[PDB]
Each structure stands twice: as C-alpha cells, then as structure tokens.
Design a protein around this ligand. Sequence first.
Ligand code: BEF
Ligand code: BEF
Ligand SMILES: [Mg+2]
Ligand SMILES: [Mg+2]
Lengths: 202, 205
Amino acid sequence: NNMNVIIADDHPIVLFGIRKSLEQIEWVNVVGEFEDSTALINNLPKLDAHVLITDLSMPGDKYGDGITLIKYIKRHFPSLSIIVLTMNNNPAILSAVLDLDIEGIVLKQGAPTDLPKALAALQKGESVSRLLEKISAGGYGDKRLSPKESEVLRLFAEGFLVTEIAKKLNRSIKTISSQKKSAMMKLGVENDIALLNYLSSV
Amino acid sequence: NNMNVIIADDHPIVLFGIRKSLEQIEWVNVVGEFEDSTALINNLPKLDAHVLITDLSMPGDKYGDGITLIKYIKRHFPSLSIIVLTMNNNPAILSAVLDLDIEGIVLKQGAPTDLPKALAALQKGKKFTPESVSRLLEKISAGDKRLSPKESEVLRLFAEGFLVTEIAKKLNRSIKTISSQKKSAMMKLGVENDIALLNYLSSVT
DNA sequence: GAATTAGGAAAAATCTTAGGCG
DNA sequence: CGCCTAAGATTTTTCCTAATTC
Ligand code: BEF
Ligand code: BEF
Ligand SMILES: [Mg+2]
Ligand SMILES: [Mg+2]
C-alpha cells in the first residue's frame, strides 16, 4: 500500500541523507520537507500524509519542539503516524520518549537503514522494542524520567536557561525548577556539571 | 584537478548524505568514511587524500573531539586541507577552530549548498564562510580575546563541578568577585549561558 | 587598560509548601 | 501515590558601578 511521508529535521545535511535513502523504495512518496515546528504545523493540512519521520530537538518559533510538539500533533492530528529520529543517545531522556506512544523511533548514530526497517515494521502492524529491551536490560532503570522531566532536561542541556524553558512551555521558574530539581534527584546529581556529565555519559 | 576526499561523522545517516552529496560532483572522489577519532587516525596515513570533511562532535577513545582533535590533525598530518562539518554553534568553540587555519567551516544546520560552495571555494584556493557562520563570528569580533590568570583559575573549578559560592568559600573572596571574573571570562570567549561555556572548556582539554 | 577586589540594587533560581489527578 | 502546577519565602547569582594598585 502506497504510504506518503513528510520529513522534519533542523539539519538539511540530514534531510538530504534521508530523502536519498527512501527513494530506493518505489511505493514510498516523500511529499514535503521542513526544518521547524512552525512551518510544519502550518503546511500539515495542505499536504496528505499517512506517516512522518520527525525530529525530537528542533526550532519552534511558536508551536514548540519535542514531547510538547509530539502530543500537539497527536491531539490535533491523530490522522498521522509519527517516527522520532533523534541524535539523543541518553537513556534518562529517551526514557519517557518511548512511553509517548509513537509509530517508530530511529537513532541518527544507528545504521543508515534503521529507518526503512521501521517503515516496514509499521506497514505490517520497529526499533522501539530493540531500544526498550536494551534500555530496560541496560541497568539504568532507576534513572527513568517523566514526559515533562525529559522535555525539561533536554532544553537545559540544549543551552537554554530555566526561565526561557518556562517562556517556551507556558509555566513559571517555580514550576520548571521542581521538574529539573526532581529530575536531578532521580539521576542522583547535586550540581549542573555532574548533571550534564550524566546527560552525555550514555 | 580531481581531488581525493575523506568523510568523518558518528551519525551514519549524516555520513550517507555527505557521501551521496559528493557523487553530484564529477571531479570529486570519496576514499574513506569513519565513525570516530581512533579510526580516522588509523587510516589517515593509509589513504592518499588531499581534503577531509570532519565533525567536531565525534566519539573516540585515544584522541579527543573538536578542537583537541583538529589540533592533532593540523600538526601530525599537516599537508591535508580541512573542512569542519558540525551541528555545533557555540561561538567560543568555532573561534579557536577557525584559529587553527582551515579552508572553511560548514554548519550542518546551514544551507545544503554550503558544502558545494565550500569545495568550489577550496577548488580555487579560497574559504567559504556562510552568513550563518559570519553571524556567530561577529560575537567575539567586538590580550583582548585572551583570558586572565584568576579568570582561567575560576573556570577550572566551575568545570571541576564546584558551584560559584563553593569557589568564593574555597579562595577567601565574595560571590560578587567570582561572578565578575566568571562572567568577565564568558564575555571574552563569546558564550552567554553556562552550557556553551563548559562545552568550550571540554573542547580545549 | 586591566586586574583583582567588591557593594548595593536586581534577576534568576531553588526551596518549602500545597492544591487536584490517574 | 507520583504527577504537573504553582506562589509565597530564600538562596544564588548576576548586573551595575567603582574602589584598589601595576
Ligand atoms: F535534533 Be535531534 F536531537 F537529532
Ligand atoms: F550531525 Be553532524 F554533527 F553534522
Ligand atoms: Mg536535529
Ligand atoms: Mg556528531
């Protein structure tokens, strides 16, 4: 069955590496490309799409990026099937990203044809099992974050301030402090330096 | 003249694009593709290559990533013309990189005709610097760029993991003294937030 | 000319504490 | 019950500004 696809990633050096990997398949039809949540959400109705290979960490002029952007597409577009393509190798973060309920998940640092082999696994009722059965079997199950803490820490390490994440997501510094201060105790780190060490070490 | 090119990035999907991209050019030939530092150094002598396309964010045991690495590549393999192709944007990083003298720097978050124009530029012994690159370069543009003793002394402890207050305590001075020196330093390097700073302090380690 | 040192005003962040949910 | 959410009081940390002496 002919399944049409849209792609979303901040890097066009990445996008131009996916579009070439999927045209191998004769039934696949890559209809649209985007680099931000704003232009993406705008041109979603105007283009018919069954499935989507969208990024985790992106620029969101208004409509936001990440688990925020995922569940706003899930709600306003249950029409679509979402595949999360991130460079985030971190378990603590990717933890709640699994629980989100997406079509399939693919890693950038995973072999190139991990994406076509999650376009088959979806077509017949992918690497969300291999991830979870590696993640749960890893020995970092005590460091399992919530869909908010994973969204908070992500943006902290991306190089935003606390108060800029509040402005990002519609909360107060008091709200976000708690979600980071909470997320830190889950990981068992006292300072930021030691936190970002556990957000690279993965 | 037809040149012999290498590619280096941990993300093989990025490697695929960069590999597929160089096929469009009739004189361009790719001799190698690598996923870390350790490997790039192994088959650096092995291949007859004039040019390299490398990430600053590449994993490796024996050799570092970014500045630490490019410093090794500039010295131990000097003949080679270099183009740095990274996601990264922390101006303090790119500052010290463009200081190691490379043909150019392609921001992986730039335009897709960056790398063609970057090889077209080096094909005529020049350096391409997109508006995306120019933008972040101005930050430090405004001795001067060089850090002070007590500033560098502080930054060391901040990176160690000692919070600002713990530094003041440890050295007999007020918080205001250290923040002045901490943020003074930051202002020199051309980094706003604590993240993009620590990212620099590791890139030069 | 800048380095090291701050002080008082100001901003950012953490700290209880506390209300309603699956 | 952990979860998001937050406003008090508090802390940390910057911001603005100006004193040292080389
Ligand atoms: F931008 Be994503 F994190 F690969
Ligand atoms: F994604 Be790479 F660092 F260009
Ligand atoms: Mg990205
Ligand atoms: Mg990388």
